[model samples]
Every structure is written in structure tokens, then in C-alpha cells.
Target: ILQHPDGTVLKQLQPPPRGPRELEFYNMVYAADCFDGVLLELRKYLPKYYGIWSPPTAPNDLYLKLEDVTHKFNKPCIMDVKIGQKSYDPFASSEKIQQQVSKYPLMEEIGFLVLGMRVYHVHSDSYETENQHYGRSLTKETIKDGVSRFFHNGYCLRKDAVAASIQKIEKILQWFENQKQLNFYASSLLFVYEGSSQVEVRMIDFAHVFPSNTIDEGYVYGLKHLISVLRSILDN
Candidate 1:
């Protein structure tokens, strides 16, 4: 995937078997046609779909081009993490597990703005960059390792940065619980960019995403565990 300044990002690759499904997700599921209830609410946090990019080589192939979400903010530090628990019932309903998030009235009172995490930093006009993936497995040991490194190991982040990261992770978990869609085989690499006071998390690589009739395990498998890790760091 490559980013451009003209509001369009381009991706060229061998389309997956579920190409049509992903296209439908962007064109229909995330669009106004299927917009309602929780999906509509979650759409506000999702990456904006611009259109397909038809280059000279793959005009016949399935191409995905989207809005460069990194362009939305200035000087953002983007990081990628995987949120998925390896074990869970793929057909279970996630609604039972969704966290009930309450609005922060005190946050407003304190003039503290939670701008929300946005997206990724894949490529730019100047140079092509590799994904800056971070995070350890959602285990106590690994979480401790990461947190210690972030503090004593010379990568100390402010309280707001950690708070924003936790908020974004919770939002994604809540979204998964509300929708009950589970992608069993692959978990989308969530790209989280932390800005000055705000952060944004976006899901990239939609080929693995699918709507499921059963509950999603992502929250238990990935979201909850990671949120615990972040919370542990915040508390320490």
C-alpha cells in the first residue's frame, strides 16, 4: 500500500478469494446502505473508503484504495498491534461480552479532550516505510516486559498517550462485541497512531474480516487481554 497527497491511497496485490466480500463491506456494509445502530456508530471510527485504484498492471484485478488516515493528523507516531485470543468459540455471540462504556463527564469538566485514536502510517511521497509493529503477546510476562521497556528502557510515554491507547483498544473491543463478527483465521492488524492529545485506531487489510452470525472472540482473545496489559502499564 502507498500513500499519496491527493486524498487517495493505492494498494496493488493479488486479490484474495474474498475480494468481493471486502469490496461489499466497504461499498455496502460500512456505507449508508447497511448503516444502522452499532455498525453506524462504529463506522465513525473506521477507515474511510475512497475507491478502487486501477493502475496499468492490475486493471482487471481487485484493487483497494482508501483515504490515507495518517494524513488526518500532523506528526503522529503510528504503531501496529494484533488483538486476538487464540482460543474461543468462533460462533459465540459477543454481545454478552461487550463492555458498557460510559461517557466521561469529568473529562469534560477537566478540559481533558479524548480525541480518539485514528489510523496508520504505511507510506508517504518521500519514502516507503515498513510497518512499525509493536506490542507483546497478551500475557502477564510479556506485558510486564513491554511496560518496563517503555519506562526504564527509554521509551517513556506520557499518561495521555497510554490513556488514548487504552481508549482505542476498548472502542474496538466494544465494536466487535456489539457487531458479533469474528474473523477466525486472521486478526486484522490494528494500526494505532498517537497524536498530541488524541489517538486513532484503524483496521487495515480487510480481506480476512467477515460478518459472522456467532459471537466474536476478538474481545476476549485480543481486546480484553491487551486492554489489561495497557491498564497494567498505566497503573504502574
Candidate 2:
């Protein structure tokens, strides 16, 4: 990824199938007449797209220039959680699915996995980074504690951030629960909040978005569990 002007970031296109499907997904929602109301609402939770770019730095490669959601925050506490019981799409090879499940077998039970996080410690005026390794270390029992740490900044828990995040996520849950237009695979819910009362949650990454007529039960299951976790954290 590379930074561009006007609160924008550019994500290099994935090779072959995924890159094309990703671009197609955005085009389908933004350009096409997707007045079905589901995508109309879903558009709010996505980063703003301005088409593709081939900037000076990576002139050879194509990138999706999009809104940098964190650009407005002074000290953003960011978290990336890979959601869904099944991360792989229908197109994914059996070998890839096998590899993914082994990497985090508990995704079957938890329905989601913490990929990484970085939170600001207000008192210390520094940040604590939680790597992928740290998230993988968490068990079903300790997952809440791991997420709680993101809200804690060595001084106090930002309950407002937790609450706001839940509200935002619930909107997404409502959308998922009702709609049967799309199935997301290997998608993550990106979270950001400064120590202040402001917070934002948005779905990021779309290399594996597939159209579906049947409800996405696995994804909905994850959202319900994730909401429960956030609700618990907010009230605590």
C-alpha cells in the first residue's frame, strides 16, 4: 500500500483472478444501478473509491486508490479482524482452504479471528502494537481479554469507543442478516478510534466477494458473535 494525496491510500492489485474480481465488485456497486437498497446501504461501510491508479512510485503496477479512513484521527487505535467462519471463497482451492483452517482452526468455533491491532497509550503518549502472532496466541477464553486490551490504553478503558464501535458493527450485522446479495470471504472489519469519543468501523478488503442468492449463514454467524463480544466489552 502507498499513500496518496487527499486522504487517499493505494492498494496494489492482487494478481490474476482476485484483482479483477475486486475491481469488479467496486464497479458493480458504485457504477452499476445497484438500487436494490442493500448495496446502497453497504456503500456507506466501504472506503470511497476513485478508480485505479498507476502512480509514479509503482508505475508498473495498478492500485485501487481509496479513502484512508484513519486520515482524520490524531491518534488512531486501529484493529483488523478477519471475520466469517469460512475465510476462503467457493473459488478457493482445497489446498488453500486446508492451509487457512490449519492456520487458525478455532475460526470454526469463534467465527472470527483477530489479525492485528495498534492502540495508543494516552498516559505514556505511545502505542502498543499487537501483531498477527499475538492474535494467533489468543484462545476462545482469552479472546475478550485480547480485544479489551485494544480499548485499554494503559490508563483507562475507552468505553465510548467500544459502544460506538458496536453501534457501527450492528448496522453491518443488520445489513448482513437481511440481505442475500453478497458473500464475503477473507474480508476484515477495520476498526479505528482515537482516545477521544470518535470511532469508526468499516468492512475492508474484497478480493473474495461472491454474489449469492442464499443467505450467508457463516458470515452472519460471525457478525453475531462479534457483536456479542463488543457488547460485553462496552458494558464492562
Candidate 3:
């Protein structure tokens, strides 16, 4: 799980709600370890791949409900850290601190703070299908069409309706100057089909994201391609 904007990720682990979902220092440690492995892989190709800024490990934190699943389950998978309700707002800053951080003095030593986590989902099939129609779905002027909603398997999401949610997301990231790596989120709408399955996949929530400007460009380009494909479907 990613550090939240309000810094409550650590606080959530105790008191009112406690257990696996609670954000613990040890959890952050594990997450940092995970990020370290990822950064190590990128170190070879990228020249300026500094490590990500993480939370401080001040006190002792314990792990809860951890059990071996390899033997019992047919397919092993990691449990998701779910976040909603817009717990933090990055844009909102303390009137005083905001002004100071604008030209923050410790700029070089620290890259960017982990604002929050983004949620996303994926579906794999025999082959890639053109799931989007065109940019017609994107509009400040009017409502769009060809959008489908249904449940596959047990979950729900925008179907192969041929529209661009990422296209809209592009505009959001542009405002932030694409400061962070990709995060995950989910859509409430569901897309059903004749022979497809309904999977509840989360996408990048992207509500309050702040990371280093040393972000991924290629991934955004790929998202753009999908948006274009959605637009194409709308034209016909």
C-alpha cells in the first residue's frame, strides 16, 4: 500500500479499525522492500532512478493474520489494500506550510511525498479486442453513448463499450504534470458481453497523487492509444 496524503496510513492500523487492512509501520516496511526490488530492476536501464520516498519506521509494528496460502489455494494471490472515501486531499495545504513548501528548501534531498494509493484492474483474454469506440465519449459539451454496464463473473466495470475513461484521466494527470507512477482503481459501471466474463477490476483512483517528476512516459502513451481506439468506435 502507498502512503496517504494525510499521513493517516499509519494511523489506520490502530484503534477504531484494526487488523490486516490497517496501515502499519511493518506494512510500510514491506511495501518499501517491494518498491526497492522494483527500483533495483529499473536501476540498470534508467540513469536517474533514485529510490522512492517512504514513511519513517519509528516504533515496533506487528504483522497480523498472515498465513501460508500456497498449499491450500489452487491459485495464490495477494490480498488487496482497499481505499476509498477520499481520505486525503493533496491539493489542500496548510495556509502557512503550503506557502513554505511552494519553494520548499529541502527540494533536492527529498523527491516527492507519497500522497496516496491508486486502484486499478485488468482482464486478459485470448486476444486483445478494440474495446473503445472513440473520443466521442469524452465531452465537456454533451453526454456520450455506446457505454455498457454489467457484471462479469462476480465483479463489475465499464464493459467493452468503446469509450475513453483514461482519456479523461489524461487531463487530470496533465494538471499534476504526471508526477507519479501508475496506481490502481475501479469503475462502478460494468460491461457485459456474449462470451466474456465480468471481473471487478480496480483502476487508478488517482484522486490525490504526488510523486517525483521522474515519471513514466511510455505508460501514458499506451493509455493514449487505448483512448484513441475508444474514439474510433464512436465515429462509426
Candidate 4:
């Protein structure tokens, strides 16, 4: 996170050594291809991209900084949903995590609502001993579990807001489906809070993006799982 002179905190996206390097990929591939067009189409859903920059001492390393979406709303709530992970251990203790889970109802009762969802992918081998920090392997069961926990811990909005969120998600899936060459592997969903118990959905992390002759099935697979989870949550 970078702090501005005015005390604003901004999150920066840089190339991690473990997995796919997004900055290089975006500059070399995405920026050159339909990246501009795709980004423009989803501009309203994504984080504001401040141009890339390199520090004087580390000229080889470039970083893409973005607006901290959490800052956009008052008392915003945020959660990252892995497309194919059952449960992620973001905490060191089970008891503590459970404690946090118990507070979900309170948060929801008080008017916490789904904000936005982020979509992206992760490679299985990306998890090494040094970086088990990221999380578990990606698979069907894991994906189902991840979606379950996502809603269990979060809150959905009224019919109108929920309808908007679902529409945005479907639009994103269709956009990728029509782009036969782009393969979205190891994706993630970032959920953020908008005011009035409404949430806007967006896809992020273009690290594993590549060209394919046919459409990628993973997007549809994940989308199906997500839709099911969302419907179940809202139905109850």
C-alpha cells in the first residue's frame, strides 16, 4: 500500500516472483492486444488504473497502482472469493476465524451488503512451501466451498440490488465467452461494499490470461457454481 501526502492509502499491483507476472504480461501482451478495449468496456467495474511506474533504483521492476476500492464507501466491507477453493485460512487460528464468522449475522443485520465481486485465476503449482500463504489447490469441490463461505460470511441486498449484481456478472461472463482467444484461468472474485446495500461486480488479476483457439470452459464452470451459490443465498 502506498500512502499519499494527504494520507490516502493506495494498493499497488506488482509482479510476484512465484506465479505469473501480471505487470509484464499486461505491458507485453494485454496492453498491446484488446486490453485497452476490454478495460474500457469494464471501466465502471474495475479499479481506476493509474499508469505504470518504475522506481529509479529498481528500474527493472514496474508496478501498477490502483484506487483502494474500500475507501470509496463509508465503512466498506471487502472479501476475496476464489473460484476454486473450499476454504481459505486467512487467519492463524480456527477459533478466531469462527469468531469472525459469528459476526457475519450482526454485520448483515446492521445493513452490510454485498458490494462488488472480483474474478481472476490461480495456478495449482503456484502454491509452494514458501508461499502457501496464497491458499489451497483449485478444483471443483474447493470452488463450491469457497462460494459457500463467501455468502455465508457476507450479506446480499434487496431484489433490485441483487438483480443488478447478477446482471453485471452475466455480462462479464458473456464478454469472456465471446472472446474466443482469451482464456481466464485461476480466476478470483473480489466483493466490495457500495452504499445503500448495493454491490458492483468486477473481475481482476490478469496474470494467467492467454490466448486460446476455443473458449475456456473454466469461466462457465465457475460461473455456474457462483450462480448456484448466489441463488441459494438469496433464496434463504
Q: By the lDDT metric, which is better: model 1 or model 3? A: 1
The global Cα lDDT (0 to 1) of model 4 is: 0.46
RMSD of each: 10.7, 2.0, 18.0, 12.4
Count clashing residue pairs in model 1. Answer: 14
In model 3, the Cα lDDT at residue 165 comes to 39
Cα lDDT of model 1 by residue, 1-236, tens digit: 57788855776544555566467666654565674776677666667776666768756865677767667665555545433442122332464223211122221122111122223223331221233222322233344444333222113444565677678767776777767654533334344344332256676545445567866654345556556656777776
Distance from true location, Cα of 91 in model 1, Å: 13
Question: Per-residue lDDT of 1-236 in model 3, one digit per residue for the tens?
Answer: 22234322222223322233223312432454466543333222111211223335833443232212122322212111112222223344576345534433221122211221111223443322222222113222221221221112113433332333334434433532434543212111111223334211122222232334444443344334434434554554
Q: Rank the candidates by lDDT, best first.
A: 2, 1, 4, 3
lDDT of each: 0.50, 0.86, 0.29, 0.46
Cα lDDT tens digits for candidate 2, 1-236: 67665799889889979897888888887876568788888889999888878867866788888889888888889999988998778977899999888888888798888999988887777878988888778898999898888899646888888888888998988888888879998899999998543388989889999999988888888888888988888767
Worst 10 residues of 2 by lDDT: 193-202
Question: Who is ahead in lDDT, 1 or 4?
Answer: 1
The TM-score leader among the candidates is 2
